[PDB]
Design a protein around this ligand. Structure first.
Ligand code: ADP
Ligand code: MG
Lengths: 81, 82
């Protein structure tokens, strides 16, 4: 539904664009408009001061010991919201 | 003899000598169908800049004009030139 919305109001198009939108990689963008003459597929240059990657490492953090989560300060911050 | 008649399925038996059309026959395609007082020119042919393309100036403006094109293609320039 996003792709049919985007492709209809997209001012230009590129070759084989229907399957291109799911197959875009991580950080890969398709820019078109009147500020760029050729609709091009670009890789956005990696952010050196990132919005901090919020993706918790999961298996290795499960792999360690059963840690004692401090429920008291978690609840008391939940309490004041 | 220099006057253009648009026809359909006119037969030329092969082989026939083929050369590029000169300036006057291409002019006769667009200029001859419109009376000289009725010609209104705002453009020329893309592949032959010497060939001017006139439209029927009365029929150009009574029947409404729809100028359509993408952003940055010059649509406002074509409107301004007309
Ligand atoms: N007949 C023409 N020959 C050469 N360049 C043109 C012609 N018409 C428009 N342009 C160029 O195309 C550019 C786009 O402007 P314009 O067509 O007015 O944009 P829009 O179609 O978005 O209003 C202009 O900067 C102009 O220089
Ligand atoms: Mg404009």
């Amino acid at each position: 539904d996003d792709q049919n919305y985007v492709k209809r109001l997209l001012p230009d198009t590129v070759g084989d664009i229907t399957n291109l939108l799911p197959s875009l990689k991580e950080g890969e963008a398709l820019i078109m408009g009147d500020s760029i003459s050729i609709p091009s597929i670009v890789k956005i240059e990696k952010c050196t001061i990132p919005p901090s990657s919020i993706d918790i490492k999961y298996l290795d953090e499960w792999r360690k010991e059963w840690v004692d989560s401090e429920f008291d300060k978690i609840i008391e911050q939940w309490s004041k919201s | 003899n220099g006057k253009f008649y648009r026809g359909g399925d006119s037969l030329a038996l092969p082989p026939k000598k083929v050369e590029p059309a000169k300036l006057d026959e291409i002019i006769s395609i667009y200029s001859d169908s419109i009376d000289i007082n009725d010609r209104f020119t705002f453009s020329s042919l893309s592949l032959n800049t010497k060939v001017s393309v006139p439209v029927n100036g009365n029929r150009f403006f009574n029947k409404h004009i729809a100028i359509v094109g993408s952003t940055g293609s010059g649509k406002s320039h074509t409107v301004a030139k007309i």
